Design a protein around this ligand. Structure first.
Ligand code: NAD
Ligand code: NAD
Ligand code: NAD
Ligand code: NAD
Ligand code: ADN
Ligand code: ADN
Ligand code: ADN
Ligand code: ADN
Ligand code: NA
Ligand code: NA
Ligand code: NA
Ligand code: NA
Lengths: 432, 432, 435, 435
C-alpha cells in the first residue's frame, strides 16, 4: 500500500508557505547553496529519506535538496516536534511527508517506514539524513537488504553521533557516516545559541511564568546546557548548574553560575531543565524533594532524562492536563508541572530553534549529502567530520544578512600567522 | 436589553479555570488581600465596573474584588488583549464580562456600555476601575447622570493618568481619582520588569525571529522603554534607543545603549518597538527608509505611535496576513511586518505581563478601590497617589514566594536613619 | 594672640606636574564643568565669594576647584575623608597658589585641623562666605565650633546622601541657620553618580587592593539604594555572584527582580568571599558576623562613614593580630580565620582606588557650581531649609554631557509636545517622576 | 676568560617583605599549585633539575617558582616582558636566595642580558637542563645562540599561543631539536586563562592607567579568539559598547551571536574611544588608523608582542610630540588629535596592572608543573615535536580548583557511565571535544 503523504490538516498549507517564505530570508546559507549548486543538479538520482523534526526550518532544507535534484521523503524524529502548517505546505507541494504534532509510538514508527520507498513504484532510498539515529536504526536493524544501494548517512545530533560511534565500536556500522553535529558551525551555534533562543520561549508559551525572581536548575553544561543557562539568565532567572565533568563545571562557575549536586539543587528550583543526553537525571527522590508547582522539562534529545515511567506509575492517577503538553502531577501534596511529557521542550512547547541558526546546521547537512552522494566510495564505514574549509564557508554565508564585515589579511599578515588569505584560519585542534 | 455576558467561546472555561488556579499561586499579593479583607466584606454594596485587559491575571483581580463583597462587571480596554479562556472562566462563574480577542471598534464601545448597569434590574455602577481612561471617558462624556452615585476612579496606566491630569487642568474631572500607575510597586515593576518579560515573548510568538545578530530600535526610555530594551538585550539583540528627554537618554547611554534620532536609527533596524505614549513616532518617511522584513510593533498604550492610517492608505492594497496579528506590507519593494496592527504587542501577540508582576499592580488596584469606596468623601475631584506605607505593604506581600528575606532594623539603627522599624523607609521624594 | 598662616599642606608638591597632566585629561572627560566655565567665566559672577570646600581632594575635584576660580571665586579646600585625597591632584592645586590642606593617610586630628584652616582666606584671614560640603563635617565645624562666622556666610551646598540626612536633622531640630541646596538629589547626581559611579569604582578598588579573581566568588552587598544597586552591578559585571541584604521591601523586591538572591546578613555572610556595606546606616557588620566569616574574606565599605563595619570591635578584640599587607589592606586573625579589611572600613572606592571617573563627576560637580551660583546671587530669597534644584537645571546638566558620547535627541514637534503635555524645550517630566 | 656571576638582579630587594605577604595570599587563591606541592613535594621528583624560566615575574609566578623548588628543582628566572615584572614579587624571590633577573621597565639590552644569566646556575655555572618558556624568547636564545647547551636539556614547556606558533614553525623548518609540551592548549589553560583571565585584567589595566569612565564609551577589540572573547567581555561587563574585528568567519559569527557589532578596522576605529588589539598578528593598527582616530583615544595591546600596533611608525612620525603622563601612559599628538598609548603597545594587562588573578593562573601553572615533571622523568619517550597533555591530567587540574569555590559534582552510576560511553572517573569527553 502506497500512501503519498500523511499530515494533520492540509488546509494549513497556505499559512505554512507564507512562513516558509519568511524563513527563506532568514536562511541565507541554504538559499546561497541553492544558487551555487542548483543549476548543476548534483543530487539528480538521489532518493533522500530524512528523519528530522518537521518544522518550517526543515521545509527549507527539504526544498533545498529538491532544488539540487533530489527526490525526498520525510518524517519527524520526535512525536511533538512537527509543525503542522510546515508539514501541510510540504505535502501541498507534492512531497511525501509523514508527520504530525502529537503522534503515538506506533504512528511514529509507521511514518519512518513509509519514507524508505519512493513513489507508487516503491524505489528504495539511497541516502539517509538522520537526527537521533532512529531512521538509521530502522534501516540497519530492520531493513538490512536496503543497505547495499544506500551511499551514506548524515547525522545531526550529539545523541545520534554517540549511537553511530557505538555501532563503529561494535562492528555494526555498515555505511559511511558524516557527523555534522560536530561541525563547529553546528555544535557551537545550534546547540548553544539555538537553545538560548528557544528554551525560555518554550517555557513561557507553556506556562507564562515570571522568570525574574525564580531559580532554575540546568542539568549539564555542554553546549546545550550552556545555551539553556544563558536563555534563563537572559530572561532574569537565577541558574544553578549540575555537572559530572569537572572542566564543564569549572566553566559554569567561571560564567557566574552556582554548581551543586542535583539532590541539593532541586530543593531550591522553581524550574528544572535537563540537558545531558544521559538517563535518570530526575528520579523519584528528586520529585519528592521539589517545591510546589515546579516546572520540569527536558531539552536533551530523548525522554529518559526525566523518569517519566516512575512519575506516571506512582502518581499518574492524579494527572491533570492543563492544555496540550502541560501536565500537572500531585506528588505527595506538592504539584509537579511536566512539559511535553519530558520530550524536547523547545520543539514540543514552542517552535524549536529560529530559522537563522538552523540555516547553519542545515547548510552542513546539504554539504554532507552532496559529499556522500558524489564520493561515498572513497569512505570507509566509519564516522567522519567535514573539513574546516567547508565549516568556514557555512559561517561566511551568514555574515551579510547581519552586516558582519571581515577584515582581509594582507599577504604579509597571512604568511606571518601561517595561513592563506581565504583560510582555513585555524588548525584542526582549535576549540573556538 | 440585558445581556448577561458576551464571550467568544464559553467551552474554554475549564482550561481558563485551570490557568487561573496556577496564576493564583503566582499572585500572593492578591491572595493575601483576599485573606486579610475577605472576612469583613468591605466592598459589600459596591458595583465595580472594570475596563482592563481581560486576561488570566485580570480574572484573579475580578475574583478578589468579588471575595471582598463587590458586584463586578467587566470589559477589555484593548481589542486584541482579551484571553478568551480567561473571559470564558469568568463568564462560567456567573460574572458579567463582555470581552473577546479581535473585536472591532463598535464592539469595543458596546462592551464598555454594558458594564455600566448591573443585573436585569440595571443597578448603575458606583465605582470605576480603568486602564487608559476609555471607561472614564464614556461615563463622564456620555453618561454624566451616573457621576452623582459613583464614589471614585482608580487608574492603571501612564496614558490614562495623563488624561486625568488634563481633565484636572481643564476642570472636567468631576470625581476623585487614585493614580496607581505611580505607585512605586507599579511603575518601577509592572512597566519595567513586565515589559522585560513580555516584549520579546510576543515578538517570538508572532515571528519566531532569531534575536541574536539583530539590531532593534526602541523609541522611548521611560519605564516601558527601559524594560523593552532589557527584554531585547537579554535575548541577544543589540538595541539602539531614541529619546527626547536628555536625562532618560543619558540613562540609556550609561546602561550601554547607543542613542540616536529615529531618522538615523530606523535605517539600521531589524526590529522596531515604540514605547513613548506619544504619537507619530514611526511615519511614512521612516517606513520608506526601512530594511526588508523589518518587524515593527508598539508597546505603548495606544496605536497612534505608529502611523497605521498612512501605512494602510498608501500600501494597504499590498497587505497580506500571515496569521492573525501578523501583517506584511510591501512599501516600495521592501516588506514591513506589522504586529497586532500597531496595538499593544505584548498583550496582542502573546499574553502580556506574567502573573507575579501583575499581582503587584492589581494589589494596588484593590487597595485604591477599598480606599475610595470607604473614604471618597474625604477626597477632592483631583488625582491622588497612595501613601508609601501601602506601596511598601504591596512589595512585602510578594517576598515570601521568591524567598526574599529582609533584615530587621534594631531600634538604634532605625533611630539613626530616622525611620520606624516597620517603615516607611524612604521619604516621599525618593526615586528608587 | 597671633595666628599661624599655612598657605597649603600637601604630601609632596613636586607631584604637581603629574597632577596637572591628569587634570588636563580629566577636563576633556568633564564637558559639563568646562561648558559652565565658558558660559559663566567671562562675567565673573562669583567675584567676592570665598568658597570653603570639604570634599575628596581628587583629580576630579581639582577641575571643580578651578571652575569656581574661573568664575571669580576665592577657594580654600580640604578633603572630607582621610584616605580619599589623590596627592598629585592636591599638589597641582597647591602649585597653582590655592590654599589646599589634604593628603592620603591623615589621622583624625590632622583631618580636623585641615578643615579649620579653610575657614580663613590668606594671611589677612578674610573669613569664608560660602560652604561647599560632602558629608556635613565642614558644616558641623562652622555651625557647632565657629558660629560667629554664620552671619556673613550666604549658603551651603551638600553633595551626599549622608550629609543631606544631617541637614534634615538640623532642619527638624531647629539648628539649620543657613539655606542649603541638596545636590545629592538632583536626578543627574543620585541616579548617575551614586549608581553608575559605584559601578565603575567598586570593583576597581577591590582589584587594586587585593588582585582577587572575581569570577567564581560570591559577594554580599548590604543595601540596595543607588549605591548598593551600582555596587551589585560592579560585582556582577566582573563575574562575581551577588547576594543582597535589605530592610526596605521595595528595594529588596527590586534586587530580586534584577536577578539577585536576597537574604539576612547572618545567613549571607557565611557564604561571602567579599562583603560590601552600602547602607549609610551603622552596625551592618558586627562581631557575630566577623566570627561567622570564611578565611580571607575581603570586607569593605562604600557608604560615606566607617560606622557600617564595627571596626572599633575588630580593633579592640583582634587588633593585636593585625598585619598590614600594604597601605589600606589590613589582615586580622579572627579566631583562626583571616579577615581582610580595606581602607580601615572607610570609603573603599576612594580609599583603595581613585573613586568615580571624571565623566560622571562632571554631572555632580556641574550641579555643585550651579548651586553655588544660585546661593551666592540669590541667598536672600531662601529660608534656612534644604532645597533642591529645579528640573530645568537638572535637564540642562544632562544635555551638556550628550555630545561627548554621541547621544543625539529627537525633538518633539509642537503637536507632539501638546499631546504629552510638555513644551518642546522641556521640562519633559513632572516633579514626581522617578526615572 | 673569567665569567661574571650575578646572583640576582631586581629593582629593590627591600620590597621582599611586602612581596612575601602577597605571595601568601596568592597561595590560598592557588589550590592547584598547592595541592601539587603536597602530592609531589615529599618525593622530590625534580631533584637534579635546573629549570630556567622565562615568564612574567609576578606574584603568581613566584608561587610557581617555589612550587618547582619544593619539588626539588634548582630554578633561575627572568621575565618574558619588559613591563610585566612585579618588583615586590621579584624581590621576595631574590630574598629567598633564588637567582632572578627581572624588573619593571627594562630596555631590550637589559631584557636579553637577564635571560642569558638564567642559563647557568650558581658561581660554578652548572648549565640548565630544562626550559620553561612563555613566548619562545628563552627557547630562541638557547637554540639560536647557545646550541652547545641543547645536549643536556631534556625538554621545553611553552605557556602561550604565540610561543606555540614559533615552536610549530621550528617543527616544520626542522630546527626543533628538543621535545616540547604545549600547555597553552590544555583546555584548562586556553579556555580559562586566555578568556577569563583577560576578562579579569583588561579593564583593570585600562582603569589603572587612565581612570576613564567605561559606561558611555565605545571600544574596538581586534580579534575574537580566546583573548578577544575575554577582552570584549571585560569591556562589556564594565559598561563599554564593543565593536569586534576579525578575519575568521566562524569567530566573527560567534561575536555577532554574542551580541557584538563586527566591522573592518578602517570603519570601526573612527568610532572608538578605546582600541584593544588581541590577534597575535602584526600591523593591526597602522598610520592610516592613527590618523582616523578621535581625540584622546586610548590604544593598547593584549596580544603577546608589540607588533600589533605600529609603534615604530608612531614614534618615527610623531615621537617629537610625545609626553609621558606617568610610567606606561604616553600621549602623542597625531595631526592635532591626541593618541594615548598604554605600555608602549606591550601586553597591557601585565604592563599597566598585575595581569591575570592568582586563581586562574593556578590552572595554567598547575599544567606547567605537570609538563616539567613529565619531561624531566620521561623526555626519552618523546620525539622533537610539540605535544599536549592527556585529557585525564587536564581534568585533574580542573578538579583541584572546585573546592575553593564550592563547586560540587554529581557522580555517574556505572549504568549512566555505560550509557554515555565513559568510565565513572573520566575522561568524560573524547579528544575532539571543544568545550
Ligand atoms: N533541544 C534541542 O534542540 C537540541 C539541540 C542540540 C542538541 N540536543 C541534544 O541535547 C543533548 C546534549 O547535547 P550537548 O551537545 O550539550 O552534549 P555535550 O556532550 O556537549 O553535553 C552533555 C553534558 O551533560 C553532562 N552530564 C552527563 N551526565 C550528567 C549527569 N548525570 N548530571 C549532570 N550532567 C551530566 C556531561 O558531562 C556533558 O557536559 C543531546 O541529547 C543532544 O542530541 C538538543
Ligand atoms: N504594554 C504594556 O503592558 C504597558 C505597560 C505599562 C505601561 N504602558 C504604556 O506604555 C507607555 C509608556 O509608559 P511609560 O510608563 O514608559 O511612560 P514614561 O513617561 O515613563 O516614558 C515615556 C518616554 O517616551 C519619551 N518620548 C516621548 N516622545 C518621544 C519621541 N517622539 N521619541 C522618542 N521618545 C519619546 C519620553 O521622553 C519618556 O521618557 C504609556 O502609553 C503607558 O500607558 C504599557
Ligand atoms: N562611595 C561613594 O562614592 C558614594 C557615592 C554616593 C553615595 N555614597 C554614600 O553611600 C551611602 C548610601 O547612599 P545611597 O544614595 O544608596 O542611599 P539610599 O538611601 O539610596 O540607600 C541606602 C539603602 O540601605 C538600606 N539599609 C539601611 N539599613 C540597612 C541594614 N541594616 N541592612 C541592609 N540594608 C539597609 C536602605 O533600606 C536603603 O535602601 C550614603 O552614606 C552616601 O552618602 C557614597
Ligand atoms: N595578555 C595576556 O595575558 C594573554 C593571555 C593569553 C594569550 N595571550 C596572547 O594573546 C594573543 C592572542 O591569543 P589567542 O589565544 O586569542 O589566539 P587565537 O588564535 O585564539 O586568536 C587570535 C584571533 O585573531 C584573529 N586575527 C588574526 N589576524 C587578525 C586581523 N588582522 N584582524 C582581526 N583579527 C585577526 C584570528 O582570526 C583569531 O581568531 C597571542 O599573542 C597570545 O600569546 C595573551
Ligand atoms: N526548528 C528546528 N527545526 C529542525 N530541527 C531543530 C529545530 N530546532 C532544533 N532542532 C534540532 O533538534 C535536534 C535534536 O534532535 C538538534 O540537534 C537541533 O539541531
Ligand atoms: N497580563 C496582563 N493583564 C492585565 N493587564 C496587563 C497585563 N500585562 C500588562 N498589562 C497592563 O497593560 C497596561 C497598558 O494598558 C499596563 O499599564 C499594564 O499594567
Ligand atoms: N573621584 C571622585 N572625586 C570626588 N568625589 C567623588 C569621587 N568619586 C566619588 N565621589 C563622591 O564621594 C561622595 C561620598 O562622600 C559621593 O557623594 C560621591 O559624589
Ligand atoms: N599574573 C600573571 N602572572 C604570570 N603570567 C600571566 C599573568 N597574567 C597573564 N599571564 C600570562 O601572560 C601570557 C602571555 O605572555 C599568557 O599566556 C598568560 O598565561
Ligand atoms: Na522556529
Ligand atoms: Na500572562
Ligand atoms: Na577617578
Ligand atoms: Na595578578
Amino acid at each position: 500500500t502506497f500512501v503519498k503523504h500523511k499530515v494533520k490538516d492540509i488546509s494549513l498549507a497556505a499559512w505554512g508557505r507564507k512562513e516558509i517564505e519568511l524563513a527563506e530570508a532568514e536562511m541565507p546559507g541554504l538559499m546561497s547553496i541553492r544558487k551555487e549548486f542548483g543549476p548543476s543538479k548534483p543530487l539528480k538520482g538521489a532518493r533522500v529519506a530524512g528523519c528530522l523534526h518537521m518544522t518550517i526550518q526543515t521545509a527549507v532544507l527539504i526544498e533545498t535538496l529538491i532544488e539540487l535534484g533530489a527526490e525526498v521523503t520525510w518524517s519527524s524524529c520526535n512525536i511533538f516536534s512537527t509543525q503542522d502548517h510546515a508539514a501541510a505546505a510540504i505535502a501541498a507541494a507534492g512531497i511525501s511527508v509523514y508527520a504530525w504534532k502529537g503522534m503515538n509510538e506506533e504512528e511514529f514508527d509507521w511514518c519512518i517506514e513509509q519514507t524508505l520507498f519512493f513513489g507508487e513504484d516503491r524505489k528504495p532510498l539511497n541516502m539517509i539524513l538522520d537526527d537521533g539515529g532512529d531512521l538509521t536504526n530502522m534501516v540497519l536493524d530492520r531493513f538490512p537488504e536496503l543497505v547495499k544501494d544506500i551511499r551514506g548517512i548524515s547525522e545531526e545530533t550529539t545523541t545520534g553521533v554517540l549511537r553511530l560511534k557505538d555501532r563503529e565500536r561494535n562492528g555494526s556500522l555498515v555505511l559511511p557516516a558524516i557527523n555534522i553535529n560536530d561541525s563547529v558551525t553546528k555544535s557551537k551555534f545550534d546547540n548553544k545559541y539555538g537553545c538560548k533562543e528557544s528554551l525560555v520561549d518554550s517555557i513561557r508559551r507553556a506556562t507564562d511564568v515570571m522568570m525574574a525572581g525564580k531559580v532554575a536548575v540546568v542539568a549539564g553544561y555542554g553546549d546545550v546546557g550552556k545555551g539553556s543557562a544563558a536563555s534563563l539568565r537572559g530572561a532574569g532567572a537565577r541558574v544553578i548548574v549540575t555537572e559530572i565533568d569537572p572542566i564543564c563545571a569549572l566553566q559554569a562557575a567561571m560564567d557566574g553560575y552556582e554548581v551543586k549536586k542535583m539532590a541539593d539543587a532541586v530543593k531550591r528550583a522553581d524550574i528544572v531543565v535537563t540537558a545531558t543526553g544521559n538517563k535518570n537525571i530526575i528520579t523519584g527522590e528528586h520529585f519528592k524533594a521539589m517545591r510546589d508547582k515546579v516546572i520540569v522539562c527536558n531539552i536533551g534529545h530523548f525522554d529518559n532524562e526525566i523518569d517519566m515511567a516512575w512519575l506516571n506509575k506512582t502518581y499518574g492517577s492524579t494527572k491533570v492536563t492543563v492544555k496540550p503538553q502541560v501536565d500537572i502531577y500531585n506528588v505527595d501534596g506538592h504539584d509537579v508541572i511536566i512539559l511535553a511529557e519530558g520530550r524536547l521542550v523547545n520543539l514540543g512547547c514552542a517552535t524549536g530553534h529560529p530559522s537563522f541558526v538552523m540555516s547553519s546546521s542545515f547548510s552542513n547537512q546539504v554539504i554532507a549529502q552532496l559529499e556522500l552522494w558524489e564520493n561515498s566510495s572513497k569512505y570507509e564505514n566509519k564516522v567522519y567530520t567535514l573539513p574546516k574549509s567547508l565549516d568556514e564557508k557555512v559561517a561566511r554565508l551568514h555574515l551579510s544578512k547581519i552586516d558582519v564585515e571581515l577584515d582581509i589579511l594582507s599577504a604579509d599578515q597571512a604568511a606571518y600567522i601561517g595561513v592563506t588569505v581565504d583560510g582555513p584560519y585555524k588548525n584542526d585542534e582549535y576549540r573556538y
